[PDB]
Amino acid sequence: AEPEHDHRKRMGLKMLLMMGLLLPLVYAMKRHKWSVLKSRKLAYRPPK
Amino acid sequence: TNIRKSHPLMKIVNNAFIDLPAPSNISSWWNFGSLLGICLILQILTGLFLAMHYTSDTTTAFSSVTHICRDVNYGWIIRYMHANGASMFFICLYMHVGRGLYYGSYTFLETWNIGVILLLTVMATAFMGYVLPWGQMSFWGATVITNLLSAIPYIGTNLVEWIWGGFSVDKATLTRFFAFHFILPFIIMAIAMVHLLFLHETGSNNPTGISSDVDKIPFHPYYTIKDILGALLLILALMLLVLFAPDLLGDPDNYTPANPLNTPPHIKPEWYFLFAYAILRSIPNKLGGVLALAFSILILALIPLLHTSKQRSMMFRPLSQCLFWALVADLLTLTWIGGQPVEHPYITIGQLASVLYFLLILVLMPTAGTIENKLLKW
Amino acid sequence: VSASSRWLEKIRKWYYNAAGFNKLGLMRDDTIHENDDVKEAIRRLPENLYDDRVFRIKRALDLSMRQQILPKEQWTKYEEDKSYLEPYLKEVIRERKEREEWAKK
Amino acid sequence: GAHLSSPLASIAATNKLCQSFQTFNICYADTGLLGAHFVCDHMSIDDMMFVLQGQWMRLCTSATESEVLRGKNLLRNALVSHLDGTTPVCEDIGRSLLTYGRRIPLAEWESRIAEVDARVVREVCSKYFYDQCPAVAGFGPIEQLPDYNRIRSGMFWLRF
Amino acid sequence: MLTRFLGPRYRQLARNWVPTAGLWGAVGAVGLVWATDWRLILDWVPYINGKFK
Amino acid sequence: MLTRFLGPRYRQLARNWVPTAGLWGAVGAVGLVWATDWRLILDWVPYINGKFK
Amino acid sequence: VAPTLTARLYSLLFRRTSTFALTIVVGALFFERAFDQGADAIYEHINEGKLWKHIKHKYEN
Amino acid sequence: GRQFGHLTRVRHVITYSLSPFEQRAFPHYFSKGIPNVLRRTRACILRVAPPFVAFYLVYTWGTQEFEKSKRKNPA
Ligand SMILES: CCCCCCCCCCCCCCCCC[C@@H](O)O[C@H](CO[C@H](O)CCCCCCCCCCCCCCC)COP(=O)(O)OCC[N+](C)(C)C
Numbered sequence: 045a046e047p048e049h050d051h052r053k054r055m056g057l058k059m060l061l062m063m064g065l066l067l068p069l070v071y072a073m074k075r076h077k078w079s080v081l082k083s084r085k086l087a088y089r090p091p092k
Numbered sequence: 093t094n095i096r097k098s099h100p101l102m103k104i105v106n107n108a109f110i111d112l113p114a115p116s117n118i119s120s121w122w123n124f125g126s127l128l129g130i131c132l133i134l135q136i137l138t139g140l141f142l143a144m145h146y147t148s149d150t151t152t153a154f155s156s157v158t159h160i161c162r163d164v165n166y167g168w169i170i171r172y173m174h175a176n177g178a179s180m181f182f183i184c185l186y187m188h189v190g191r192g193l194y195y196g197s198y199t200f201l202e203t204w205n206i207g208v209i210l211l212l213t214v215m216a217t218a219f220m221g222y223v224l225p226w227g228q229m230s231f232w233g234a235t236v237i238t239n240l241l242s243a244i245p246y247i248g249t250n251l252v253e254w255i256w257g258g259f260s261v262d263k264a265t266l267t268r269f270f271a272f273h274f275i276l277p278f279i280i281m282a283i284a285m286v287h288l289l290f291l292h293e294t295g296s297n298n299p300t301g302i303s304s305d306v307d308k309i310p311f312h313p314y315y316t317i318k319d320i321l322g323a324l325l326l327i328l329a330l331m332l333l334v335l336f337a338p339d340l341l342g343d344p345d346n347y348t349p350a351n352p353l354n355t356p357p358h359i360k361p362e363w364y365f366l367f368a369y370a371i372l373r374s375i376p377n378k379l380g381g382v383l384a385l386a387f388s389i390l391i392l393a394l395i396p397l398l399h400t401s402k403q404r405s406m407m408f409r410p411l412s413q414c415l416f417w418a419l420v421a422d423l424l425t426l427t428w429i430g431g432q433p434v435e436h437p438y439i440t441i442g443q444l445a446s447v448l449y450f451l452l453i454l455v456l457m458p459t460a461g462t463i464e465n466k467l468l469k470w
Numbered sequence: 471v472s473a474s475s476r477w478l479e480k481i482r483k484w485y486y487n488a489a490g491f492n493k494l495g496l497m498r499d500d501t502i503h504e505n506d507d508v509k510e511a512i513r514r515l516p517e518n519l520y521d522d523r524v525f526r527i528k529r530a531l532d533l534s535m536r537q538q539i540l541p542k543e544q545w546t547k548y549e550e551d552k553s554y555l556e557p558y559l560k561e562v563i564r565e566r567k568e569r570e571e572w573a574k575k
Numbered sequence: 576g577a578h579l580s581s582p583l584a585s586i587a588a589t590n591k592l593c594q595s596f597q598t599f600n601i602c603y604a605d606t607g608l609l610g611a612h613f614v615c616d617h618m619s620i621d622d623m624m625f626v627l628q629g630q631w632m633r634l635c636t637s638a639t640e641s642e643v644l645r646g647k648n649l650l651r652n653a654l655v656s657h658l659d660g661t662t663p664v665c666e667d668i669g670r671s672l673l674t675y676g677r678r679i680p681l682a683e684w685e686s687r688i689a690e691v692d693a694r695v696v697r698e699v700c701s702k703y704f705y706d707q708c709p710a711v712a713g714f715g716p717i718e719q720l721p722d723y724n725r726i727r728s729g730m731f732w733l734r735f
Numbered sequence: 736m737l738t739r740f741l742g743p744r745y746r747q748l749a750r751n752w753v754p755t756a757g758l759w760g761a762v763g764a765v766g767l768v769w770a771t772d773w774r775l776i777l778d779w780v781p782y783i784n785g786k787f788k
Numbered sequence: 789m790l791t792r793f794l795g796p797r798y799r800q801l802a803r804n805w806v807p808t809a810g811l812w813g814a815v816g817a818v819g820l821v822w823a824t825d826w827r828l829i830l831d832w833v834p835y836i837n838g839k840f841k
Numbered sequence: 842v843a844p845t846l847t848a849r850l851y852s853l854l855f856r857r858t859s860t861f862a863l864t865i866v867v868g869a870l871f872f873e874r875a876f877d878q879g880a881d882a883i884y885e886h887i888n889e890g891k892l893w894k895h896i897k898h899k900y901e902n
Numbered sequence: 903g904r905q906f907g908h909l910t911r912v913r914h915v916i917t918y919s920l921s922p923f924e925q926r927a928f929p930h931y932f933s934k935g936i937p938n939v940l941r942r943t944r945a946c947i948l949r950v951a952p953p954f955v956a957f958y959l960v961y962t963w964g965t966q967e968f969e970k971s972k973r974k975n976p977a
């Protein structure tokens with residue numbers, strides 16, 4: 045009914061191991077880029 | 093000066109995907125727009141590679157689908173990528189419409205009404221899609237939905253027969269549905285680019301509903317990388333569904349070839365039609381059933397005319413928040429009930445939820461906004 | 471004594487706190503949906519008020535991004551909520567309605 | 576205007592990208608500020624940055640021999656024009672002794688100038704400019720002033 | 736939102752445009768009747784008798 | 789149309805850009821070799837031996 | 842690890858986009874080998890003998 | 903469409919930013935994040951949870967009423 049059974053599960057493990065490496069790494073790429081905004085300080089200095 | 097700004101092709105790309113002034117505070121809820129675009133493209137590339145080995149006739153329709161999975165190298169992945177991407181496309185559609193309601197995004201009239209037309213079209217696509225394998229659910233699901241069109245007063249039967257190519261869901265209908273299912277994702281893409289045109293005329297809304305002109309950031313790198321991360325999650329959710337549970341969302345009846353005589357016990361839509369199926373089955377009348385199904389989606393075109401609140405977003409609107417989640421939980425009810433037979437506990441609460449969907453959008457949430465205005469002395 | 475009128479006011483104070491724009495330093499008129507009448511009234515504000523408005527919205531959109539709120543002490547108090555836009559918008563609607571009345575005859 | 580040697584100056588003049596720009600090498604003991612300052616209309620900040628950073632990178636990667644002669648020539652002329660009269664020279668004696676511990680004679684400056692060739696420029700410009708984090712200060716109508724990430728991205732080239 | 740559209744000028748504006756709006760309906764009717772071949776309407780037309788039994 | 793591109797500056801401009809243009813070719817080669825699995829080139833690589841007979 | 846391994850990796854490979862690219866493509870080829878069969882070996886352990894690759898020698902001419 | 907330098911008028915707001923290479927990507931990831939996430943949850947639980955509980959109990963009763971209906975008890 046499902047011959048590919050073994051292959052999908054073999055690929056699924058590789059997918060999980062890939063995502064386990066990739067997901068924290070892309071998040072780290074995002075955070076560092078976003079950090080310029082995430083630590084930005086505002087100050088309002090109106091005149092007089 | 094700058095090549096990326098003044099070239100009559102790179103300029104158009106720059107002003108849409110690079111230098112675009114975007115709000116600094118848009119949620120993960122704004123990711124679904126790009127994720128829809130990914131979904132649409134993903135369906136095209138799996139769709140085509142499927143269309144290469146698939147046949148359109150009754151005699152070979154079911155077998156070619158099997159041929160793909162069994163014989164064609166890595167055909168089984170392409171096949172399940174498609175099937176699961178179809179509903180992944182629906183979860184994104186649902187997130188995206190939901191976000192539009194919550195955050196008052198709908199106030200962008202043209203861009204929102206185009207989105208409704210996008211929804212109808214993607215759903216018209218998927219309904220034509222599931223028929224193609226020519227399984228039991230393919231046929232009888234096709235039969236159940238088309239037969240509804242017999243109810244349209246004077247014009248009734250001539251219409252259904254015209255869409256049929258005969259007196260039942262026959263030979264003509266399979267191949268005809270294939271042609272329409274090939275073209276519609278391209279029309280979808282064209283309508284999706286106008287969707288993006290009308291949108292860029294204002295820029296995005298944000299979680300607060302206050303204008304963000306005072307704090308705009310460039311779409312690159314901030315939203316390039318936020319969309320890159322978001323797409324990785326989509327592939328995770330789509331691929332866990334493909335490499336571990338390829339039929340979890342799938343009905344087993346579709347694994348037996350179509351029989352126009354033997355009709356199955358349950359007539360189960362794919363999950364994304366269950367809420368709408370429920371609304372339709374709840375009303376006894378033929379004409380009224382279809383007109384309620386139609387109304388169930390075309391209602392979103394009324395929501396802007398029924399904005400009553402002085403604020404844009406639900407972010408600072410507590411009563412409206414409760415009424416929103418009532419709509420989500422109610423839609424969760426319509427879903428579950430749609431996947432159930434029309435017996436005792438299910439007739440009543442299914443009919444009840446139907447009234448609630450409409451009373452909530454047409455009356456209840458428009459009242460909450462008036463009260464919420466009054467409490468702020470607005 | 472005004473026992474009812476201070477409970478009917480206390481519901482409002484409750485709602486205000488529940489609305490939570492005050493957590494993000496906002497004032498009620500900062501959260502209004504900008505339509506033509508509103509866009510006009512924003513236009514008519516004097517320099518000081520317009521400048522103060524922009525800052526609040528910037529500070530609000532900033533926190534909304536970092537997914538934060540202000541310390542409790544620094545929230546807008548329901549009492550201290552300056553309804554600075556209302557007379558400007560009242561005048562714009564009053565002006566529009568005169569147009570709409572003249573267009574009728 | 577249009578005929579100026581410096582590509583930035585000529586692109587600035589032609590496209591009126593700018594009311595004024597100037598490069599600087601501000602020196603303090605063991606540290607400094609190296610870069611440019613400009614003044615321009617609200618709609619020209621982006622282009623001014625692009626054209627400036629593009630020149631830093633051009634110099635970092637592909638400085639050519641003749642423009643390096645012109646640079647050396649402008650510098651000998653500047654150094655000799657500055658040292659005109661009692662005030663500028665007295666200032667040079669005072670400052671030099673406080674920084675260099677001695678007066679560096681003019682022939683030594685010429686010696687050290689003549690040594691610079693195209694390779695020197697691109698080695699030295701890369702040392703200080705290539706893939707380095709700028710300090711950026713903006714004032715006035717600055718909505719169009721590029722985001723830091725974008726400015727920082729102009730500090731390298733994907734082609735190099 | 737609709738009270739702004741009611742007054743003497745709009746009374747004149749509706750009357751001014753009604754012979755036209757009626758004639759466009761006649762266009763749409765004849766147009767729909769002719770295009771689908773509504774023998775229901777067309778049987779009673781003194782020359783168009785393509786159903787000639 | 790090509791005589792304008794020949795002179796001492798362009799001699800320097802070519803030399804300045806050649807270590808880079810060479811390294812992009814190495815990128816393209818390794819890149820093409822890796823992507824198609826050119827066992828012709830890859831058989832002679834001391835760890836990549838997926839053809840492990 | 843004297844001036845840090847990451848510092849010497851930057852100055853030697855990451856600086857120029859050319860050597861940065863070359864490090865990725867050279868790295869993508871190395872990694873593909875160590876991961877394909879390296880993850881296949883972990884797939885072996887959860888299916889110790891129930892795979893045809895383990896059975897093999899039972900039916901040999 | 904709109905572009906920077908044409909969006910709106912803003913006066914008197916200084917913004918101090920830092921380079922990503924000068925700062926850490928996760929400053930206090932768990933020591934600030936967890937306090938924040940509960941705070942975020944507490945802010946919304948009374949607004950999102952009550953219809954879902956109401957659905958859940960309708961779901962659990964409804965299904966229990968479905969099966970316990972077709973079987974008999976007398977003749
Ligand atoms: C569209 C539907 C698909 C959905 C996909 C969603 C999943 C996400 C994946 C999308 C790809 C995103 C890539 C991740 C972003 C990282 C940024 C990357 O592109 O690097 C950039 C630059 O690109 C790389 O340098 C190019 C390297 C090339 C490596 C080869 C890639 C493999 C392709 C093989 C090429 C051979 C051609 C094939 C011949 C058949 C910028 O680098 P940066 O972080 O700013 O560092 C600056 C550079 N410094 C260090 C020099 C200062």
Ligand code: HEC
Binds near residue numbers: 185
């Ligand atoms: C009527 C519901 C509707 C549907 C369905 C819809 N759109 Fe949208 N879309 C909108 C609205 C309204 C916005 C404005 C959201 C905002 O900026 O807050 C929007 C925003 C977007 C965005 C910008 C990113 C974002 O999320 O704000 C993209 C991209 C997008 N739509 C594409 C699509 C695609 C692709 C489809 C599927 C064919 C689609 N949309 C379906 C109404 C919808």
Ligand code: HEC
Binds near residue numbers: 221274
């Ligand atoms: C290149 C033409 C093509 C495009 C584009 C296309 N598909 Fe399909 N799709 C097919 C074919 C052929 C099949 C039948 C083979 C099969 O069932 O896998 C099919 C199958 C389906 C099915 C049945 C899934 C199953 O296997 O049970 C659904 C649902 C579907 N498509 C929805 C979509 C949606 C949604 C889109 C994007 C709007 C789309 N498809 C894009 C050709 C296309």
Ligand SMILES: CO/C(=C/C(N)=O)[C@H](C)[C@H](/C=C/c1csc(-c2csc([C@@H](C)/C=C/C=C/C(C)C)n2)n1)OC
Binds near residue numbers: 219362
């Ligand atoms: C082909 O049959 C099925 C497909 C599926 N993907 O679930 C189900 C088994 C079936 C379908 C249920 C269903 C419910 S609801 C719906 C549907 C189809 S079509 C539509 C409208 C809203 C769209 C109209 C678009 C019109 C444009 C052409 C202008 N709604 N189909 O169950 C009976």
